[PDB]
Design a binder for this molecule. Structure first.
Ligand SMILES: NC(=O)C1=CN([C@@H]2O[C@H](COP(=O)(O)OP(=O)(O)OC[C@H]3O[C@@H](n4cnc5c(N)ncnc54)[C@H](OP(=O)(O)O)[C@@H]3O)[C@@H](O)[C@H]2O)C=CC1
Ligand SMILES: CCc1nc(N)nc(N)c1C#CCc1cc(OC)ccc1OC
Length: 157
């Protein structure tokens, strides 16, 4: 399976100044559950802003940098290399990779953050006429998760 995994707000903001614009522990749990034991593919910028590989899954970084080397990270140099990766692969960001991959993925795991944040990074526009709603689950609000959010699993029609 080739999937997108993304959290975006009401205007499809995914980032601001190399950071996530929101604090949502419930969404990190969602990511952890979905991708533990599987593969995350991300662009160089997303990885650098994270800082280190995410534990207990394969971390794959796409870059043109032939010098790129991090312990616990596998490197690829073209989109085409993605399709040779075995298992369930999640496209993890950022904007450039989503733009390159949105028309290629089987399905998308989207966390819709129900707010309007300042952003400099965006998920590409998409229509629900191309995508079936496999599931839609409202995230739970509590002390540590204070922004409304909905987990969508969308499958290409
Ligand atoms: N809310 C969310 O779900 C997530 C948020 N984000 C946010 O997005 C931001 C990063 O997005 P963005 O700025 O677009 O950067 P990206 O994460 O998409 O990385 C861009 C870099 O990836 C490499 N790359 C991309 N495509 C190719 C290719 N075809 N061949 C070789 N290398 C390639 C290049 O690296 P190089 O220049 O080294 O060659 C490029 O400069 C971050 O600020 C982050 O916070 C990201 C993912 C998820
Ligand atoms: C955890 C944020 C997130 N959620 C979903 N649902 N999909 C994603 N692709 C992402 C992401 C991301 C990049 C990122 C992750 C991170 O986890 C510790 C920390 C920082 C990040 O970029 C600043």
């Amino acid at each position: 399976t080739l999937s997108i995994l993304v959290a975006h707000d009401l205007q499809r903001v995914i980032g601001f100044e190399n950071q996530l614009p929101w604090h949502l522990p419930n969404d990190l749990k969602h990511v952890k559950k979905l991708s533990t034991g599987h593969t995350l593919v991300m662009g160089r910028k997303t990885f650098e802003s994270i800082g280190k590989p995410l534990p207990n899954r394969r971390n794959v970084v796409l870059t043109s940098d032939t010098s790129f080397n991090v312990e616990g990270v596998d490197v690829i140099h073209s989109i085409e290399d993605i399709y040779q990766l075995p298992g369930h692969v999640f496209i993890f960001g950022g904007q450039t990779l989503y733009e390159e991959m949105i028309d290629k993925v089987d399905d998308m795991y989207i966390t819709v953050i129900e707010g309007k944040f300042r952003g400099d990074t965006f998920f590409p526009p998409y229509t629900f006429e191309d995508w079936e709603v496999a599931s839609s689950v409202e995230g739970k609000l509590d002390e540590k998760n204070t922004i409304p959010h909905t987990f969508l699993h969308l499958i290409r029609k």
